[PDB]
Design a protein around this ligand. Structure first.
Ligand SMILES: [Zn+2]
Length: 183
């Protein structure tokens, strides 16, 4: 095998930040968002990564007992913006250089964009992700949670940094965040 979820700040001090259609809980390190809606994820670095640095997002199941299962869209939702393959859970909006990738070995999907430094007047780089299936399509009986793993990689695909966060795609993110935080 499964992709590692191990936090790895690496040489460049790679960290994530987060800002309802999308709400994040630091307490739970969990994003709550609606299907297909904008999910802004911030990339923070302490120094600039090398030229050709790329940013990959992939979903895995959080529970060890389900980690070998590939996270994909349910049969209903699978059966597109013109760019994303229909099976891919995670899309990127507002980027002209998106790559949708299927691992030849593990069959796992991922979505990659070039690393861009922050825009003038900003301190971080923001990527807008969209999740294209609900957690209720995704986790059968006991509602199986997923993680998004964000990796900073060099141009050859070598690991430069890694962070992750749990995600719940749901109709009412504010309500679910509240409930899970109370629990
Ligand atoms: Zn679905």
């Amino acid at each position: 095998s499964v992709p590692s979820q191990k936090t790895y700040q690496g040489s460049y001090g790679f960290r994530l930040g987060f800002l309802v259609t999308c709400t994040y809980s630091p307490a739970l390190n969990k994003m709550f968002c609606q299907l297909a809606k904008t999910c802004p994820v911030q990339l923070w670095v302490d120094s600039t990564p090398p030229p050709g640095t790329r940013v990959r997002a992939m979903a895995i199941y959080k529970q060890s007992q389900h980690m070998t299962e590939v996270v994909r869209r349910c049969p209903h939702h699978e059966r597109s913006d013109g760019l994303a393959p229909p099976q891919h859970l995670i899309r990127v909006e507002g980027n002209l250089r998106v790559e949708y990738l299927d691992d030849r070995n593990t069959f796992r999907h991922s979505v990659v964009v070039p690393y861009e430094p922050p825009e003038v007047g900003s301190d971080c780089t923001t990527i807008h992700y969209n999740y294209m299936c609900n957690s209720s399509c995704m986790g059968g009986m006991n509602r199986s949670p997923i993680l998004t793993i964000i990796t900073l990689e060099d141009s050859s695909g070598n690991l430069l940094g890694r962070n992750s966060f749990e995600v719940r795609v749901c109709a009412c993110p504010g309500r679910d965040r509240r409930t899970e935080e109370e629990n």
